[PDB]
Write a protein that binds this DNA or RNA. Structure first.
Lengths: 97, 84, 200, 108, 90, 92, 109, 80, 97
DNA sequence: TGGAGAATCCCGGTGCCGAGGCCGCTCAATTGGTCGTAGACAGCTCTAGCACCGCTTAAACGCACGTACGCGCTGTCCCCCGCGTTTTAACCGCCAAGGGGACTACTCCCTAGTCTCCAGGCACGTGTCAGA
DNA sequence: TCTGACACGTGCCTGGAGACTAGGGAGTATCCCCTTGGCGGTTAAAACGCGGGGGACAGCGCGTACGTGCGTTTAAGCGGTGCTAGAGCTGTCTACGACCAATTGAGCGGCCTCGGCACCGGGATTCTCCA
């Protein structure tokens, strides 16, 4: 049949998901994660829809920026594959612990 | 009502792949996903803790959008589009 | 006419005016020329100074609560929570008063349904003190008039009684647990019920 | 009296001088607020709004869209150097990112 | 209170056949509020440094030179001084 | 010019009695006290402006300490502030 | 006629100037009104933070066998504690120096 | 004129040794001089803005401290 | 005799991470500060404490940058730092577009 | 190098949902006047910043040697991409319950304002003890 | 073993504390929209398996570029003198901004309408990989 070489569909996904404006994580699992994180701080807590939407937008933008820095750390080490040490280096240089 | 446990697995592996595709990553290792889940959990704890503090200062039970916006502007991550 | 009460009935203490003000039809005359024929089902009693939940606790003489201490049976509308109102009426002596809580109508429900709006079932049309204030076109201008004079609202004589605990005052103090809300037994139109206090 | 002229009308501005004066007076910034400060700050705000909106309109025209969506504002901010420097710690909601694929990831 | 009609007026002054969406107007409202908060806080801090209890056009002018980058600061000073000169002469 | 130098003397002699201090160390501690004071006061001002309150009270300072200070530091600072406020309001 | 002038820091049991914190809060343009317990609370928080810094700095000075707190001791005190390093991450201490850190790949085998 | 060459190669080597650097390239020094020039340009420009707001011909330590505080580089020990 | 290449560097790392002295000379840094400030305003006086504050800030910034540069060099399986390490460490923190 | 097949772009039609204009009103901006007071302006002091010379000496610079390290090439084998099939639960719609928040009078305590006074805190002389 | 920077004692001064009042800011006082929980069909998407290919990674040679050492230069650094811009404080006076009363008009909520754009479908045009 037909089969694409490894990396063509990845570049197509890069173009497709950099052209779009959507939120990439599914809404209900992120909402449930927000509930289970907030239940460790104060019980019987309610959330508006816009608060969960704001948390999702901020977290997705933070993860996209972290993945850009992670990709540049991978390119610096003569690699095209991102690894946990890349994320650790990016967070260490940014000052996050 | 009940207790919620192990909801970090809802941040699936294709979701992390799609967020890395937007970040321009061509090839992703298999150990990336757990680190991304931990990073997201740390970030969400740091933002939701400040949002809960802003909510408890106002003597309310509901977390509004402005509480999250103030909790993000606290951390130098100002968000445009949810009031301000 | 003969179907109007005088000032002789209102010379009662706090708890009998809580008890003997049941089954009397509260009829309000709004200026369209129509009647309401609404009979009340439950009342509440505030003793005044010794009652910790009353507005006149410890000899309070605020100018807002001024239509109480000149004669028994003086009507007193008081504003609550911004727009809502409540129906207090004084008893014999200073401080003692009874509050109107809930009523059921036999006719005129269409006019009160129209006037209720600024989802509209008969069970929740006037099940509440602010609900009956908003269903009777009662404003803050009714404080200057009594119960038994001229052409405004009065009462009509009609043809078991269960005492329930206080709900909405909090679990504090010493006078917040006395049974003073007397309501009719078996009625499904009661706003605040007590399934454990019905067995005496 | 005379005809009531808005301070924005005599300052040649569309942004409100009086609202900026009220927000400076009620913002607990200083005990006194001068007369020229709301005029000056309304001019600065009008200039920055015009600079973002011109590039956002150009980005909407390049996408064959009459209306301005958040993506056009993001493309306006992140393509200008000075606006991206001013808004470097700002996330625009429903804005996405710039299309940027690295040279070593593209095939030869 | 929002800056919606003023942003729409500026948009029709700049791009007369281009509209805007509600989310874009919310973002522009947030941008105007953020820049106002930045410049007003900088001017308050500058007045607190120099023992002054007033905020004048000079305070906002050096606050704009502190906050905005180069060409943005120069041009924002240009229309700010133009607006102050037009306000004092009319 | 007023400073916090004699109070740093008092705290240091309370907790490290046979230990001196230099002038540059006092400049650093005075700048540290001023920085933390400005941080907590600005956070309390923001908390008052968000809730449409024109008064800064002990609740806003407590919430500012919870927002700014890290965990165990925040817990112990809230404990010390609550002890000081209860001791101040108890004695008249 | 007037009673004994008892300071507010003695009422609060504190050492920082509650009166100076109140005056600095009133003139700092933070709010129109300033409550009574806010200077007491803020002075207590500042005194606790000063006490923690001086504990760790005196410990660092005693470890280096000298009885005087120098800025190197304050830098070691701040950076050797995780929470004080988190609070003072964007802070440069003058005459402060750095921690002795050599990575494992730089040390000889 | 010049004056960036006064930040000499042993000074950059000493700063790298304080940072923990074991071996340094020969192209590090010009890049470090450029980065130091950019940082000093930003802080000095902000300090001159604070000085010229106060109608002074003298740049003080207060202006440098406030210029550093604006960039997130708060510096204790000089009166901040 | 002659020492091995690297042990004098380790000795310098150990002896320069204990001292708190200032590593750039005073007069060249003062001349650099005046040369930079000549572009902004003409005939500026300088306090000595201003130049000392600028020196402390510049030395701290360069030492932190060299720490991040060393992390980037170790990440790419090197011990020799290169300008690409400096550029990566400045781009991750946001100092370079 | 040509050609098959998948993906992507272009064009035409449809419908809906929200931007955009109109209108009444009401709340906040404008106008006019008054009243203190912050700050502009001139002047004087004296502080500290700059300009310059000498010297001595630690640091910088140029050069030589060489060995450690960056870097290009090579082999391998592990891990991840691409794709197909199967299974899970996310998304949508509807509905009911119940706590939680809008909401505005009221009324009371608390905090600004002001006078007085006095003692804590700041500037300055003294010896004195830790660190080079 | 010296010496200079910090601890200690003294005098004045100014701002913080006691004390009283005014008034305004904040706490408190049922009901209805908002959020949450559940049910249920639908299907979009996640999850698992498997082949294979290509990239991470270890090994190796080599060639050169920094490290280190040493002689020579050079200008930082310290001391000292001299001088004048300019910070810093004070006094005076007046322009300017807070504050308030009356007026009025522009912005905001409510309401209604039609066009921009998302979507669907078919066909033309890249575009990627393999014999």
């Amino acid at each position: 049949p037909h089969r694409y070489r490894p990396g063509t569909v990845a570049l197509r996904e890069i173009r497709r998901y950099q052209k779009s404006t959507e939120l990439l994580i599914r809404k209900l699992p992120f909402q449930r994660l927000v509930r289970e994180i907030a239940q460790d701080f104060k019980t019987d807590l309610r959330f508006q829809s816009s608060a969960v939407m704001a948390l999702q937008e901020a977290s997705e933008a933070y993860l996209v920026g972290l993945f850009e820095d992670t990709n540049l750390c991978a390119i610096h080490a003569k690699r095209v594959t991102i690894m946990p040490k890349d994320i650790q280096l990016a967070r260490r240089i940014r000052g996050e612990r | 009502r009940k207790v919620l446990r192990d909801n970090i697995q809802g941040i699936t592996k294709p979701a992390i792949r799609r967020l890395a595709r937007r970040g321009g990553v061509k090839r992703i290792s298999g150990l990336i996903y757990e680190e991304t889940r931990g990073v997201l959990k740390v970030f969400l704890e740091n933002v939701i803790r400040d949002a809960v503090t802003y909510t408890e200062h106002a003597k309310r039970k509901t977390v509004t959008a402005m509480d999250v916006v103030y909790a993000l502007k606290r951390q130098g991550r100002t968000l445009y589009g949810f009031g301000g | 006419h003969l179907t109007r009460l005088g000032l002789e009935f209102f010379d009662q203490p706090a708890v009998p005016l809580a008890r003997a003000f049941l089954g009397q039809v509260l009829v309000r005359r709004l200026p369209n020329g129509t009647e309401l024929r609404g009979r009340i089902v439950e009342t509440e009693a505030y003793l005044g100074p010794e009652d910790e939940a009353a507005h006149s606790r410890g000899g309070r003489q605020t100018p807002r609560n001024r239509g109480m201490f000149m004669k028994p049976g003086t009507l007193y509308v008081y504003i609550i929570y911004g727009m809502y109102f409540c129906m207090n009426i004084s008893s014999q002596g200073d401080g003692a008063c009874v509050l109107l809580r809930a009523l059921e109508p036999l006719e005129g429900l269409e006019t009160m349904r129209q006037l209720r709006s600024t989802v509209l079932k008969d069970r929740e049309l006037c099940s509440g003190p602010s609900k009956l204030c908003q269903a009777l076109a009662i404003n803050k201008s009714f404080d200057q008039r009594d119960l038994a004079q001229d052409e405004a609202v009065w009462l009509e004589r009609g043809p078991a009684v269960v005492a329930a605990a206080r709900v909405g005052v909090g679990h504090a103090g010493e006078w917040a647990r006395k049974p003073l809300r007397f309501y009719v037994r078996g009625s499904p139109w009661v706003s605040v019920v007590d399934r454990v206090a019905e067995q005496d | 009296r005379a005809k009531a002229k808005t301070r924005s009308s005599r300052a040649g501005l569309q942004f409100p001088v009086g609202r900026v004066h009220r927000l400076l007076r009620k913002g607990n910034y200083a005990e006194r607020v001068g007369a020229g400060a709301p005029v000056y700050l309304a001019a600065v705000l009008e200039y920055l709004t015009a600079e973002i909106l011109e590039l956002a309109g150009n980005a909407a025209r390049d996408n064959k869209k009459t209306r301005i969506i958040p993506r056009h504002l993001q493309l306006a901010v992140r393509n200008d150097e000075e606006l991206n420097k001013l808004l470097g710690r700002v996330t625009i909601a429903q804005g996405g990112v710039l299309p940027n694929i690295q040279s070593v990831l593209l095939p030869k | 209170e929002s800056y919606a009609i003023y942003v729409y007026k500026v948009l029709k002054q700049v791009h007369p056949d281009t509209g805007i969406s509600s989310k874009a107007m919310s973002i522009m409202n947030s941008f105007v509020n953020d820049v106002f908060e930045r410049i007003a806080g900088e001017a308050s801090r500058l007045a607190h440094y120099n023992k002054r209890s007033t905020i004048t056009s000079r305070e906002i002018q050096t606050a704009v030179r502190l906050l905005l980058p180069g060409e943005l600061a120069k041009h924002a000073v240009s229309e700010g001084t133009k607006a102050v000169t037009k306000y004092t002469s009319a």
